[PDB]
Amino acid sequence: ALLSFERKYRVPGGTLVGGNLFDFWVGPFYVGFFGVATFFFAALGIILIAWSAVLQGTWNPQLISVYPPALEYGLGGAPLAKGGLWQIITICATGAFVSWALREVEICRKLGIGYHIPFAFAFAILAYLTLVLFRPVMMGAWGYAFPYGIWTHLDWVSNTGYTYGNFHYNPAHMIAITFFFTNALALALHGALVLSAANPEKGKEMRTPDHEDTFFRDLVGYSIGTLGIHRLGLLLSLSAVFFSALCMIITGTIWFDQWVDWWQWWVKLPWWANIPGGING
């Protein structure tokens, strides 16, 4: 089925691979070559997760957990039930995520729109790869990666973090969190601002964009504008994920101590480390 305005857009063309071979839709979903690839990697990764559930011996989804290889395996291949399924599932997930991004590129081309959306999605893929590829390889073992289980992967975050003290003190973590909080603040404000103009007080005409600008100048003295706010939402959310990957790629590779040590540089400068009283003297 089609939306009422959809037909005129369903033209041939725009594919990267295969010409018109996969240039069609299944229901609302566009296919394309990378839709076929996505199906392949996903289906197989789902089969493997089913296999790992049998080997584990449970059908409940909260218990299924696919672990990476023991640290002693280093960066090498492992037997299926001893870290190998994790390795093959990671291959299929990577393939699926990348295939999804290239399918989005083909859709962008058929519709004549910019490529911002697959470009933004690539930042998420890079964060995922930072945790399961870049960091483990740099530290020398697949077992530094996280397990694929609902609750086990939370335990992994806690294990990893407390290994370095209070992870709060990681300064790139601080910057990431600041972007995450500021993003949700900006998102709440933007959704609210537009709805408050399109759905004004009872008894009123729809407001204009000038009312939105006027509201924010009255409130805080500055309006970023209708284009700038969507630029800003993109910037804030990507920066949050960039500094997330940064704060992890440096942990266990160039930093090994309790993260609170990092600031003790500021504390033990020779020109004030010895002044009595205060906190650090």
Added chain:
Amino acid sequence: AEYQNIFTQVQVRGPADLGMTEDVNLANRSGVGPFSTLLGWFGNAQLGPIYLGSLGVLSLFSGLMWFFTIGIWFWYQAGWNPAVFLRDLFFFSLEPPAPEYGLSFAAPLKEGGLWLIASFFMFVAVWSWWGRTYLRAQALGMGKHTAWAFLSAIWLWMVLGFIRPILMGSWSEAVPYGIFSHLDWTNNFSLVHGNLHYNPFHGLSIAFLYGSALLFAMHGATILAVSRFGGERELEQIADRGTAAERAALFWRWTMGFNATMEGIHRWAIWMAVLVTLTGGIGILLSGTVVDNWYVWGQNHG
């Protein structure tokens, strides 16, 4: 390289925009500030005017009093020596009264008194700011969505510093005013309650925090991708759907099987963000009042 519309290419400037009037009291608007070429590469260059009425003045005064109260404490903790001040700035902490004082307001100044004075100033500053977000929208004839969304953030702050300590029996349960100390507080909170990862409202709160970054990445990128058809003029696309709104909808429909409208995506957005602090406040409220150990609590259920 094709133009990406991340930064403006050519800036234009006209007479300063003094804004809509509607029912705004123009006595309380400032003059216009300077135009900023720097900001103009990313958004609007105009600074000001701002609106400063009674509630705004009450809020700024209260908020500065809160700020000054903490700073005077920090100077006293630094033995009034500026070098210790800058050196240990992130370490100083205005802590709440000790649990011996219960919910009393009779803690001595150096033993929790100043914390109670600071918190009062902060209480006046935030709620009078909230009144401002309501009245600024009312004066322009707008819906009240911003004041309602701000309430969700206020809810978590109220539970952390006021509602939960009250139900617990002591101000000592509240959060200290300090960079590092409030971090240490957060960590110890999870340890004391049996691991906040297993508080399902904490889990929900995280899903919406992640979900907010997901959604704004999607929506910001979508609008930039259709800016070549005027896509950021979202209000007139609501009143009169253009090819920008259709292509934006069809991208997402072809990609994931369903789509939004130009108005409806802003309802997804407001709710995704608001639920962060909504669920978070509930999860903190139940910690220590109803549930002492989230892991153990979790074990006896799903």
Added chain:
Amino acid sequence: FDLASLAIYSFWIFLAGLIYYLQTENMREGYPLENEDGTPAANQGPFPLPKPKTFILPHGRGTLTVPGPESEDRPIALARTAVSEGFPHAPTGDPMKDGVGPASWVARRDLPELDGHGHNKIKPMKAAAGFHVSAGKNPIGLPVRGCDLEIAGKVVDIWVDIPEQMARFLEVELKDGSTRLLPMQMVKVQSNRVHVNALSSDLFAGIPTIKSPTEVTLLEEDKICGYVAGGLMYAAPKR
């Protein structure tokens, strides 16, 4: 069954109602679903259409009620290319002139967007009391180059969004002395020229014209921006 249990159960029932409300709010345009011949689809899904809501448009421009009976209000020069659904529809003419595919435009109102005061939102600078360039490369008088690396014309004005103080279109004079609008988002202002990747030089004359030298209507903007973006697909034998 403690209070925390009751709360988390309650939250999930609230969440499911919220999702159902959000999804129906998002069906106010484009629904009901149609078959590829335009008759209504049998399977509309498990969410019902929302009840209509009304917007009162500013400046005496009427009301909008959605959902309501939908219509393209324009001919669509495409032909079905398969009995089964799910396959592309093929252009029966020149898709850039017929405005289909990535060259599509929507039949918006043939009126200009107005600002908060009821004045035209977009104006050529030479009619815009007090406006001027403030930073970056002033492109007026620069030559405009297409993707064939030939020159199509030169910039004779900038069309500015007054309320938002933003350049939205370049006005370009062609060899015959007529002009066309080019969307700001589809051009690269360089030190010595404006480069347009979407169009070859000989496709500029086919950009749709506007009926007034000092205003552009919503319908005209859609035809112009649709045409220019369609060149990415349909001018490719010239890139």
